[PDB]
């Protein structure tokens, strides 16, 4: 199959404003949210019907318990970071853990933290160490690296457990995740400011979101600037994007092993 990923995020907010949770934890398979938990609901809930349909109540009940523990731990860790930095008021703490199953069968794993939305600690599962961005992160790194059992446990979770969870979830959501919805592509030609013609290459209705679009002048890649539009969710499970140039021109689109040419 194509490359797929499993990730879980955690967000801790010290001193939240009214109506903002103190703790949120959300899971994703690729671009799809799969699970959700916050300090308000205090429950782990499915975010995909295929997650709800395939995991029995005991899964949700068990993880709700673990998340209530993780919630408390996150708060304590943000308080310790704030004291180290000597910061008052509202500050954020974040975590992203995950893995990828590449098309070739090879795998990647990641575990990282942020303080006020900036990189804080990066786990290196290959050297079994933490990369500290500053002196406070260094204090944490020294404490965490002294726990050898935790470093080893983490590498096994990243490399083995995560990949097995990803494979399980991929099977559950195969009708959503493993499908292909090809793009509908068009080219729009227009004279803009007098003398300057803009050519837009617009694609929509596609799934997965990963799409390559470029512009070529006589079979060779452009030497001028191409403006790229972001891959945006249309709201129906499909995506849209574009690529434009000014000025023999052709738009090239690659999506899920299928290549397309629109000669202008």
């Amino acid at each position: 199959m194509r490359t797929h990923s499993l990730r879980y995020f955690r967000l801790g907010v010290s001193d939240p404003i009214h109506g903002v949770p103190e703790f949120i934890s959300v899971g994703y398979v690729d671009s799809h949210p799969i699970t959700t938990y916050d300090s308000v609901t205090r429950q782990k809930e499915p975010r995909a019907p295929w997650m709800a349909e395939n995991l029995a109540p005991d899964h949700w009940e068990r993880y709700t318990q673990l998340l209530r523990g993780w919630q408390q731990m996150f708060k304590v860790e943000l308080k310790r970071l704030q004291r180290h930095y000597n910061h008052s008021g509202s500050h954020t703490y974040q975590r992203m853990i995950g893995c990828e199953l590449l098309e070739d069968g090879s795998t990647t794993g990641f575990l990282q933290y942020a303080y006020d939305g900036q990189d804080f600690l990066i786990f290196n599962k290959d050297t079994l160490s933490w990369l500290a961005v500053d002196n406070v992160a260094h204090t944490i790194k020294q404490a965490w690296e002294a726990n050898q059992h935790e470093l080893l446990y983490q590498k096994n979770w990243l490399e083995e457990e995560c990949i097995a969870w990803l494979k399980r979830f991929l099977e559950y959501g195969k009708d959503t995740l493993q499908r292909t919805e090809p793009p509908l592509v068009r080219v729009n030609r227009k004279e803009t400011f007098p003398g300057v013609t803009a050519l837009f290459c617009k694609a929509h209705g596609f799934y997965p979101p990963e799409i390559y679009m470029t512009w070529m002048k006589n079979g060779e890649e452009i030497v001028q600037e191409i403006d790229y539009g972001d891959i945006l969710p249309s709201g129906d499970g499909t995506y849209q994007a574009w690529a434009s140039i000014e000025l023999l021109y052709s738009c090239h689109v690659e999506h899920s092993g299928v290549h397309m040419v629109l000669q202008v």
Partner: antibody, heavy 108, light 113 residues
Framework: QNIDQPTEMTATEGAIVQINCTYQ??????LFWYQQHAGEAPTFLSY??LDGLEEKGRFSSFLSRSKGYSYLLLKELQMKDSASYLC??????????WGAGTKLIIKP | GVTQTPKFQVLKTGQSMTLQCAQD?????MYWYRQDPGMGLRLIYY???????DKGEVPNGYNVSRLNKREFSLRLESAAPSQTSVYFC?????????????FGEGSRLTVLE
């Protein structure tokens, strides 16, 4: 689902003993070895999560994830080593599943 | 580490009982197990942090209270002879690897008609 370890093992003092533990669990988050002397609380001996042998004095703990198996090796056996050795595994949902334990009798 | 009381108890069938457990290791995770001959420890109830508790494998005939972060009580509402066992309170910082489980000294309960 299952943690299997022998009910009892008898070895001679000064000798070596290997207490086996095979697990058949849904996921794996590490294996523990605990020692429990008769009428006392269990106490931690080791934790294994990656493959290989860890040597802590006269005691060694081995893990093979592909084989779903571990062993606790006790060298230069002493009478004080007569205890029950408990094997425990954290599964994919972090549930700590405990084996029935192995009673180790040392022959003087 | 993990302090539990009482070490021994004789109860008459139908009597209520409370086993107390305290840890001063600033641990989040807390457990109540029963140890019976021929089998591994069976989790009765557990508490993942202060403010939460959930059933284990054998919760029937028992209830718990995570009183605060330090204390986790086990209650037998109406003692039955099948509840004759050795009870262990345990604690850990978290559920992930890198967090050793610590046990109390044990509580032997004998329930008689």
């Amino acid at each position: 689902q299952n943690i299997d370890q022998p009910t009892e093992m008898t070895a001679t003092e000064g000798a070596i003993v290997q207490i086996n533990c095979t697990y058949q669990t849904s996921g794996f988050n590490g294996l523990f070895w605990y020692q429990q002397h008769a009428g006392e609380a269990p106490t931690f001996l080791s934790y294994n999560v990656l493959d290989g042998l860890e040597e802590k004095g006269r005691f060694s703990s081995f893990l093979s994830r592909s084989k779903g198996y571990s062993y606790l090796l006790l060298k230069e056996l002493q009478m004080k080593d007569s205890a029950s050795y408990l094997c425990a595994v954290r599964d994919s949902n972090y549930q700590l599943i405990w084996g029935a334990g192995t009673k180790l009798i040392i022959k003087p | 580490g993990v302090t539990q009381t009482p070490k021994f108890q004789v109860l008459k069938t139908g009597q209520s009982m409370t086993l107390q457990c305290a840890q001063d290791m600033n641990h989040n995770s807390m457990y109540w197990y029963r140890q019976d001959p021929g089998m591994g420890l069976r989790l009765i109830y557990y508490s993942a942090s202060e403010g939460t508790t959930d059933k284990g494998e054998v919760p029937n005939g028992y209830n718990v209270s995570r009183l605060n972060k330090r204390e986790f009580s086990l209650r037998l509402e109406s003692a039955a002879p099948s509840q004759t066992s050795v009870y262990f309170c345990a604690s850990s910082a978290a559920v992930e690897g890198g967090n050793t489980i610590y046990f109390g000294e044990g509580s032997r309960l004998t329930v008689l008609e």
